[PDB]
Design a protein around this ligand. Structure first.
Ligand SMILES: [Ca+2]
Ligand SMILES: [Ca+2]
Ligand code: NI
Ligand code: NI
Length: 283
């Protein structure tokens, strides 16, 4: 045989059968991700989406970044994502406070967003699960909400590029130097498009160094991901399903949304503490 990408497809009721799934993806590399059906009920997802559409959102609209100047290959985002922020994190910590309050209000404890996701991550690892805190106790955000309208996409990228950004300076003191995972849950799905695609092409600073400009390297990534060479797997999770996968290691993208229903997702990242005795999750 020739090595392939491997993913599980399970129901949320079965997570306790995989008590070392996170270690198996990050450390052992025995598989690459999983889709977990029905982490949240469909009626909870619909309620949250309606809050955002109608504006009774607990203040969430006050931290919507429309990104209007950055082209069609970016989403709009509720909350500041830590990627790209200044290393002091002052703006990020303020938006993170607002995000946690607004999210808890919208979910009405039925079930609570943080409580439910932490339960999943604990069942797949056996470890305690925490949202990190800054050097003076400021909370990170557990998640951000990505909003993709008709004609918009999420350009191909890879998670371990975060380790090369000034915004990661403080988190680097808390995390093990292994792969970060990606997680997300759809609140609303589109008529067509909006598919997550994971490629076998990996993060590779050594290959990037063969190019005088990063924009030349990314032109070659775009060539490679459309060839018969790289493998690819595609998912279109329903509302309330979680996708959990090694986005730190593998290039991935979200295809252009088609139709009049927006794609809305809530999600972030997770990684090991330096002693591999705790899981941290954030966006
Ligand atoms: Ca499709
Ligand atoms: Ca339509
Ligand atoms: Ni990503
Ligand atoms: Ni080209």
């Amino acid at each position: 045989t020739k090595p392939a990408l491997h993913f599980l497809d399970i129901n949320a009721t079965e997570v306790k059968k995989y008590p070392t799934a996170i270690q198996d993806i990050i450390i052992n590399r025995s598989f690459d991700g999983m889709i977990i059906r029905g982490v949240f009920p469909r009626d909870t997802m619909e309620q949250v989406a309606r809050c955002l559409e109608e504006g009774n959102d607990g203040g969430m609209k006050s931290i919507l970044n429309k990104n209007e100047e950055f082209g069609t290959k970016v989403a709009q985002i509720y909350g500041h994502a830590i990627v790209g922020q200044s290393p002091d994190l002052k703006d990020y910590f303020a938006s993170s406070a607002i995000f946690r309050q607004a999210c808890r209000t919208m979910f009405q404890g039925s079930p609570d967003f943080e409580e439910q996701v932490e339960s999943i991550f604990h069942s797949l690892s056996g470890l305690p699960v925490e949202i990190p805190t800054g050097p003076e106790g400021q909370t990170y955000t557990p998640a951000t909400i990505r909003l993709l309208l008709e004609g918009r996409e999420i350009a191909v990228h890879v998670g371990n590029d975060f380790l090369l950004m000034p915004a990661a300076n403080h988190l680097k003191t808390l995390l093990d130097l292994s792969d970060q995972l990606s997680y997300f849950i759809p609140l609303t799905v589109p008529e067509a498009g909006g598919e997550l695609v994971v490629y076998s092409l990996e993060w590779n600073p050594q290959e990037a160094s063969k190019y005088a400009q990063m924009q030349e390297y990314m032109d070659d990534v775009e060539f490679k991901i459309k060839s018969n060479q790289s493998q690819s797997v595609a998912y279109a999770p329903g509302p309330g399903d979680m996708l959990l996968f090694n986005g730190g290691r593998y290039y991935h993208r979200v295809s252009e949304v088609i139709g009049n229903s927006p794609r809305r997702t809530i999600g972030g990242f997770l990684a090991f503490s330096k002693q591999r005795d705790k899981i941290y999750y954030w966006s």
